[PDB]
Design a protein around this ligand. Structure first.
Ligand SMILES: Cn1nc(Nc2nc(N[C@@H]3c4ccccc4C[C@@H]3O)nc3[nH]ncc23)cc1C(C)(C)C
Ligand SMILES: Cn1nc(Nc2nc(N[C@H]3c4ccccc4C[C@@H]3O)nc3[nH]ncc23)cc1C(C)(C)C
Lengths: 452, 454
């Protein structure tokens, strides 16, 4: 072949080793360097990678192409050597996208629901004995050597530079939401992405989303729509909720109605399931596998995870947890609560992540955070950053308070939430723990706290 | 998707696409106003042909391909839309073909067409028979075989086409990136993005003699082979010598002995075309003998800086050159190619503007570029179905140029006889360039067979 040897600089990095593993599976020679030996380098060695510890120019000798992590500098002697001798140096994210050229690629795109849908697809495919390699957050998983399956299922992030270079056989678009970020450019991006499908590929489009519906005429590829919409090709009807479990019937062309459940509440998960069913159906997966895959799906950790119930005087409070820390993600979580439980008062705990992000998206935070009925704003999680005046939780409290609708309660990172929050809570409330940093710890503690 | 339906399948660019899709094993139907040898040929390859347009001709199509000439009101298109059948423009489906073959995409501002054709010629000499695409038309060597039969598909890649960034080549050429006579940052990014459509194991063939290509070289994270006269080019022409219509030069390639070649077309631009072709043929494993034969017996592409030969006048002769370019930027490149190859020779240019709209839109660029000739014969605008626009015609251009004091254009009408007009002006050692489309294509053939120059 033209290129035989692929050399990874920083091969122990979090998403690097998965790529190396699948390239070995494809039958390339793979070498890699890292500052530190680890179980990751050990594993790659057993799969037939040549590993170097330390960086020196000669580690790249005989490389046809380099792949570098974001942690690698251009003055790294291996990179420098490759450049001096005109060897191509490819970013990790670009090589990750390239993998779909070698497999039946199912790209899951859209603003909201990509991760859960990717994971659901993988679950249903597994139920039909297919063991797909799937990609979430740049990490490759399967259940075996990564890449063995003919199937590769991956989140497709529209802000990644390799998005418009993906070559899927099947593309999902869950929705196109431009809020809290032109809108016209975003639509065009999705249209262009869908045109990377072959003329015989498949676009799986949520017609419940107004913007998806709007761009439907521009797609010019085989399309299957899904949603609650009456004109959707694949439809959920007879939706009923039973504690944590949602039941519904799915209508599909030239098939009898199919009754399914999913063990995670909210209309958003019906839509996730629908997208999965379109893809499983088109792939020829049995009704039995679909039912089992959906039914026994646990959820993705801290993706609108319902932790259950806190006991208070006169009833209970539903506890919800989500790691989203961008305004657009938070707004969607809140909308999911308002849609699913329109009568229930929303008590939100929010911690901003990073001062830079708080500064950059400040006005959007003021708007979105103001949608809560009760707001507890936790001190910023710095993630190593120095404070920025006028761009912190105290300022946000003031910005929101000034608007006359809501009076946020500020608290510090070392405070104990349970005694703070319990006196505020009333039976029928929803308590949302929202953010990363210190927030992840909270819901597990609340659920095992004496006060509840 | 089993059945693909073409609306206007007898169109010059439509029939080739249909033929390749048949070859790939799709069912293909198409409609056209008129039966012809074109529809007959498609029938032999298994196409179902309808004469006339009616909605039901599209019944049972999984996808439509629509000619550039045909709009949404065509009953077949309307029917497909009403029933949510995907409607693909011709240009888009053309681009799709590369996914199914070893695609060689030839991009850049200047030299795409000749290079495409040269590649095809050299591949043919090595007993390959590639399908190749020039001006949206698909061709191969020897009409026996079915378009698409070869594993190779060579095509011009035009950066202004909407499907440019959807090409999926195995090999991509960039001849040059020139923004003259027309955002520059967006243009560069477009070419970078096109090159990134290559797989990590594909090949980029880059003309480093071009400043802008050289500039973007470091952003290409793909295997690259550079070509040019530049000393640092991977593939280099040296010892360039001209012998009438024939150019000799030696080509240096990595890990190879120098290779002596000739091409039967004058000008440095054709050395560069040859170099790009040699990179590609070499990388594909084509023999030195095939390369030599392919280059040597290459005539040129019709009306792409075509040298028609010689007109006889008192005291010697006039080199007749013909080119269809009708945008200022194309004309400027032609003139620069004449000034570089023949810096001593007086340039007499016949130019006909194409369209009143284009004349209006690019007016000042025409004044500037047309003013580069030593002698200028401006022919009346070719309308191409357009109504006249006041102030945007050849008479206005004559005045705009004449007022500047350097050059005094000679106006003539579309129906005038050029030969008696031009002969008394011509002097031995002139270059006579016939430049433009419309009525211009007819001129050089007539001049060469005219008694006045016999
Ligand atoms: C037929 N044909 N073929 C071309 N091919 C290439 N032309 C150039 N450049 C050019 C050149 C070179 C020397 C003198 C003038 C000019 C002007 C232009 O700038 N660069 C190249 N790289 N690879 C190929 C190639 C160009 C052309 C013209 C004559 C139709 C424009
Ligand atoms: C885990 N997860 N999964 C999602 N999946 C989808 N969410 C929506 N959209 C909307 C929706 C639907 C119901 C209630 C509220 C909202 C608001 C959201 O915008 N549309 C979809 N189409 N296909 C899938 C899908 C969404 C989410 C959240 C909860 C993290 C945002």
């Amino acid at each position: 072949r033209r290129i035989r040897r692929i050399h990874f600089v920083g091969i122990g990095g979090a998403g690097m080793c998965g790529i190396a593993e699948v390239l070995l599976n494809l039958g390339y020679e793979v070498s890699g360097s890292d500052l530190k030996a680890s179980a990751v380098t050990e594993r790659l060695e057993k799969f037939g990678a040549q590993i170097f510890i330390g960086h020196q120019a000669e580690n790249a000798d005989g490389a046809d192409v380099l792949v570098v992590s974001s942690a690698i500098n251009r003055a790294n002697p291996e990179v420098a050597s490759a450049l001096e001798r005109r060897i191509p140096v490819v970013p990790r994210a670009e090589m990750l996208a390239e993998l779909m050229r070698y497999r039946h690629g199912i790209a899951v795109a859209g603003t909201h629901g990509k991760t859960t849908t990717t994971s659901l697809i993988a679950s249903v495919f597994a139920a039909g004995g297919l063991d797909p390699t799937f990609v979430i957050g740049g990490r490759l998983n399967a259940a075996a050597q990564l890449g063995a399956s003919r199937y590769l299922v991956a989140e497709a992030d529209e802000s990644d530079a390799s998005f418009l270079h993906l070559q899927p056989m099947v593309a999902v678009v869950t929705n196109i939401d431009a809020d809290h970020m032109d809108f016209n450019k975003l639509k065009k991006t999705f249209v262009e992405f869908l045109h990377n499908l072959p003329f015989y590929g498949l676009a799986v489009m949520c017609v419940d989303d107004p913007v998806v519906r709007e761009i439907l005429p521009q797609i010019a590829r085989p399309t299957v729509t899904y949603g609650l919409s009456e004109d959707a090709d694949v439809r959920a009807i007879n939706i009923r909720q039973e504690g944590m479990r949602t039941w519904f019937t799915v209508l599909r062309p030239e098939r009898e109605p199919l009754d399914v459940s999913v063990n995670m509440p909210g209309l958003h998960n019906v839509l996730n399931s629908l997208a999965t069913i379109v893809i499983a159906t088109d792939e020829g997966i049995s009704d039995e596998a679909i039912v089992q895959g959906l039914s026994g799906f646990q959820g993705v950790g801290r993706r609108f995870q319902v932790y259950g119930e806190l006991q208070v005087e006169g009833g209970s409070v539903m506890l919800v947890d989500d790691y989203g820390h961008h305004p657009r993600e938070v707004a969607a979580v809140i909308k999911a609560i308002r849609g699913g439980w329109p009568e229930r008062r929303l008590v939100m705990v929010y911690q901003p992540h990073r001062y830079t992000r708080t500064r950059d998206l400040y006005e959007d935070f003021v708007q979105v955070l103001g949608e809560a009925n009760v707001l507890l704003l936790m001190e910023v999680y710095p993630a190593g950053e120095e404070p920025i005046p006028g761009a912190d939780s105290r300022q946000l409290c003031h910005s929101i308070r000034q608007r006359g609708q809501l009076d946020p309660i500020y608290f510090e990172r070392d405070a104990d939430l349970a005694p703070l929050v319990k006196p505020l809570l009333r039976a029928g409330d929803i308590l949302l723990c929202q953010g990363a940093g210190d927030v992840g710890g909270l819901a597990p503690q609340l659920i095992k706290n004496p006060l509840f």
